[PDB]
Design a protein around this ligand. Structure first.
Ligand code: NAG
Ligand code: NAG
Lengths: 34, 101, 51, 49
């Protein structure tokens, strides 16, 4: 008798840059450079 | 592009355009990194908001273990899940039966 | 001196000045990644325009 | 993380230092240091205090 918490995730994501790391795996990523 | 401009003003134009290209490329990189960090922090903040909101709803009746699962002392059924889901649950109704555990 | 974030073990038997590993390792990893991102030379060679 | 590890065995006084009710030895120091501590061995002794 318990309830747990969580969030959606994907098997394969996209590596994006960030302010403190390189190639962080996230769920989705759009393209800002045409 | 077809007929070449004077060489000095062409070099000035290329140097200015290269400096503007450097400024816009650095601005784009800083922008992408900053808003990716803010999106990750926003997702973490929303998860923390949901976790603490469920903790405040469950009160002393459910003690957190350090996993995200809540050990509710009362026999909290499916309607009890609905009550803690859509902001309906009251701890004062169930504290008497969940206090001794 | 071992790590950034440490512990003060007060067991009424001694003073254990230990150091954690996971959180300080994540902090050093993020900070050195930040310096690897930012502290870099330019990739564009410029030219001398004036004299 | 330390607060989640110490369920009822220790509480925050207000200055940010936990007050463990039960007897928590140097092995218990190590257990909460490398995150192997369990509440299943000292729920009752800390609850009675
Ligand atoms: C991810 O973003 C793209 C836009 O690039 C969108 O088409 C797609 O529906 C989004 N979701 C998934 C699961 O791919
Ligand atoms: C300016 O740069 C372009 C390439 O972007 C080049 O074709 C052109 O020759 C340059 N201008 C001069 C005066 O060299």
């Amino acid at each position: 008798d318990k309830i747990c918490l969580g969030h959606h995730a994907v098997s394969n994501g996209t590596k994006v840059n960030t302010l403190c790391e390189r190639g962080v795996e996230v769920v989705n990523a759009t393209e800002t450079v045409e | 592009e077809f007929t070449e401009v004077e060489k000095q003003i062409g070099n000035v134009i290329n140097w200015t355009r290269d400096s503007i290209t450097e400024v816009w490329s650095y601005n784009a990189e800083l922008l992408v990194a900053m808003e990716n960090q803010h999106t990750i922090d926003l997702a973490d903040s929303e998860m923390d908001k949901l976790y603490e909101r469920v903790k405040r709803q469950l009160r002393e009746n459910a003690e957190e273990d350090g996993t995200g699962c809540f050990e509710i002392f009362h026999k909290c059924d499916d309607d009890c899940m609905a009550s803690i889901r859509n902001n309906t649950y009251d701890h004062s109704k169930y504290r008497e039966e969940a206090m001794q555990n | 001196i071992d790590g950034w974030y440490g512990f003060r073990h007060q067991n009424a038997q001694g003073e254990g000045t230990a150091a954690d590993y996971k959180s300080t390792q994540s902090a050093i990893d993020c900070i050195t990644g930040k310096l690897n991102r930012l502290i870099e030379k330019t990739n564009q060679q410029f030219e001398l325009i004036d004299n």
